[PDB]
Write a protein that binds this DNA or RNA. Structure first.
Ligand SMILES: [Zn+2]
Lengths: 53, 44, 96, 117
RNA sequence: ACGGAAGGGCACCACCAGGAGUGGAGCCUGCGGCUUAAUUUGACUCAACACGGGGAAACUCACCAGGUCCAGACACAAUAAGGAUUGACAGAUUGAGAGCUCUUUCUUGAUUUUGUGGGUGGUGGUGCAUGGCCGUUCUUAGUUGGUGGAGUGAUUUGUCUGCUUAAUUGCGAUAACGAACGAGACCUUAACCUACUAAAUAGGGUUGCUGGCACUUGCCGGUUGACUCUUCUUAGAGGGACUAUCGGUUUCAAGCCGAUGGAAGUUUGAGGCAAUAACAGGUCUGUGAUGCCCUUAGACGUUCUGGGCCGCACGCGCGCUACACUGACGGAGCCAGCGAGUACAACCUUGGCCGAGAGGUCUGGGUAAUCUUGUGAAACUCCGUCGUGCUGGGGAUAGAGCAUUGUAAUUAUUGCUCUUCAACGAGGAAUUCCUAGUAAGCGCAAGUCAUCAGCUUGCGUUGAUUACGUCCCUGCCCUUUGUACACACC
């Protein structure tokens, strides 16, 4: 409704986000995952990652 | 903020730009619309 | 909640044909996907539904889900005025 | 398309990871071990192994018929390409996920702490 | 459980034999103190201090300085169109083409506004109300129950004088007999295979077509023209190692030590997984994981805009670059491996022109053993210039401009171009890490990333000196002794 209600958020840390909740810190963007490093340890083997060595 | 100074039955010429849609507002040689935000200057 | 009532009846419309709504959590968006209304307009409409009977919903992975109960189908028939033998998703269209 | 093979293989894993998380919520009341997806040509077989099979299906296509429409709007699919079946579980004793749901009920109802174990 | 009590063991998070150095210098960056309107919070001995994947230009963001917004779901009730209330250019207004409203009388037609309940939201409060996960006691050798014995009983032997092992690992001695968990086994990776099974996205030979060359047969090639194959190369599927075979040395037992064969002889190298029992160790600042207390619109929810997280007499902690001649400054020579990479975005980006640089531009190719890419990367090699003088070593402070990424670079973002040319002649007590493709030089790639490595996690080149033992020091495990301790010597 109001005119000014945004910023150029097409880059940096504020615009980027995870899939689960939306944390702006500790973000894995490798291979287009977008799941933060706390939840990645929980969901490693379901995706297919394993601790071989 | 405000209650809008509500008062029904109020109480004139139609719009030049639009069709039979909105009426003009009478002031001391000053005019502006309602729906099309506010786009008048000269008297009509 | 401050929604001109032309837009609110279009949310009941689109719910009744398909029987499912998958609304994103993103507020301050130009318009919703598929349906031609705002995201804040759509979420608050289905938010008001949950209080007065219905609707089966979640808050998971930034995706609000909404699927109507049996009494919820009867409520929507009153406003939109459709009598009986209609769309929803209790029974299939034909072979599916 | 046309996407690299490394990106789609990781994206395949997250697609399933979402599906497994929602069915934990949605099939909490009716029992739920997991999901097994098998992407054949055109169609996709999604086998849900659960204890109460007929309740997961519903009243001759109601629960699963609504759930198939949900998966389409989430991940962008057409009517025909997805088919949600319901099969029985190979025993409860070995399948340790089934005991957690029974234990969750017994604490929520109001049963003994030690004698449940 | 302690012991400023005694025996026997073990570890470069101990020490010997040594190597590199940090503590000294300048500067990068965390933590204090000071500072401040705000200089946002966690963390405190090993187990806080380049840690929160924390490199903040606004977002981030829990903090100030000054403002906007309803995003008050809903139960019922006060005006309920003689409007519930929604919007509103123009200039006073206002950081301001925020109707923010105070100047205004048109819109808008029951969505709501107005009471009392009711919430929803929170990088609000408590890690001493909790759950998960991580840390540490400890990657150490330790822990349990079944019959049988010794005890009225708490309990106890089994789980032990010895000798070995990296290890309660095994031999042997016996009120003890057999068993389980931990370790070992298992799994992943690095080596060996001219024997299988294979490929113009891997490389070689036969040869052709062809380009040049020494002029005899032969040398260097340029084409994915043809034919065929498997040494390198990738990766299936197998074998190879079992201390093998000998020699000494041991109740001549279990092992350990000297040869020989062998690609491999420290568990063949390194990691991955990791017992019972705990600590009131860390996290409510990953969370629609969360108890209840607070906060619930004049908002500690919010939303936009400037400013700070980086203030500077002063301390400690990791770090980078130097204190030059085994060197610096020139050409010439010229070799790796881990990775990574857009089509709905703006990724890696050769080749060609413009430019003393940085970087401009035309074009591609690549969704990736196909194109960047042979990621011809550094240190190095070899001839010249300087030579032991704060010097041509060293690069900090400084000023002007030329580039780039951004809505925005003044509180130098980042790089470049000439000038400015200091501090430091091998570092006091102390003190950390380390037994072989390791140590220490050396760069490269990734992680965060619109733009920013002096950081962390990974890779390959250059490749030592010195033990091959011991409880003297600092702490860990058992046994035997003593206790007026048992939230257990704080
Ligand atoms: Zn008009």
């Amino acid at each position: 409704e109001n005119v000014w209600y945004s910023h150029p958020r097409k880059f940096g840390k504020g615009s980027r986000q995870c899939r689960i909740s939306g944390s702006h810190s500790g973000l894995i963007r490798k291979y287009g995952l977008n799941i933060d490093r706390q939840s990645f340890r929980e969901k490693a083997n379901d995706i297919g990652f394993y601790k071989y060595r | 903020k405000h209650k809008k100074v509500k008062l029904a039955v109020l109480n004139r010429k139609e719009c030049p730009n639009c069709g039979p849609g909105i009426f003009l507002a009478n002031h001391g040689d000053r005019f502006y619309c309602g729906k099309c935000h506010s786009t008048f200057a000269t008297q009509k | 909640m401050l929604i001109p009532k032309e837009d609110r009846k279009k949310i009941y419309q689109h719910l009744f044909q398909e029987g499912v709504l998958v609304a994103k959590k993103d507020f301050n968006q130009p318009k919703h996907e598929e349906i031609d209304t705002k995201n804040l307009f759509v979420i608050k409409a289905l938010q008001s539904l949950t209080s007065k009977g219905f609707v089966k919903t979640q808050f998971s992975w930034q995706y609000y889900y909404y699927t109507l109960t049996e009494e919820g189908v009867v409520y929507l028939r009153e406003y939109l005025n459709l009598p009986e033998h209609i769309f929803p998703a209790t029974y299939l269209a034909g072979q599916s | 398309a046309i996407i690299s093979k490394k990106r789609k293989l990781v994206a395949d894993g997250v697609f399933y990871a979402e599906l497994n998380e929602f069915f934990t919520r949605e099939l909490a009341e009716e029992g739920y071990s997991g999901v097994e997806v098998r992407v054949t040509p055109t169609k996709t077989e999604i086998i849900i192994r659960a204890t109460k099979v007929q309740d997961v299906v519903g009243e001759n296509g109601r629960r699963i018929n609504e759930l198939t429409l949900l998966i389409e709007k989430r991940f962008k699919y057409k009517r025909g390409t997805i088919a949600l079946y319901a099969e029985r579980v190979h025993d409860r004793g070995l399948s340790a996920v089934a005991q957690a749901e029974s234990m969750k009920f017994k604490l929520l109802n109001g049963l003994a702490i030690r004698r449940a174990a």
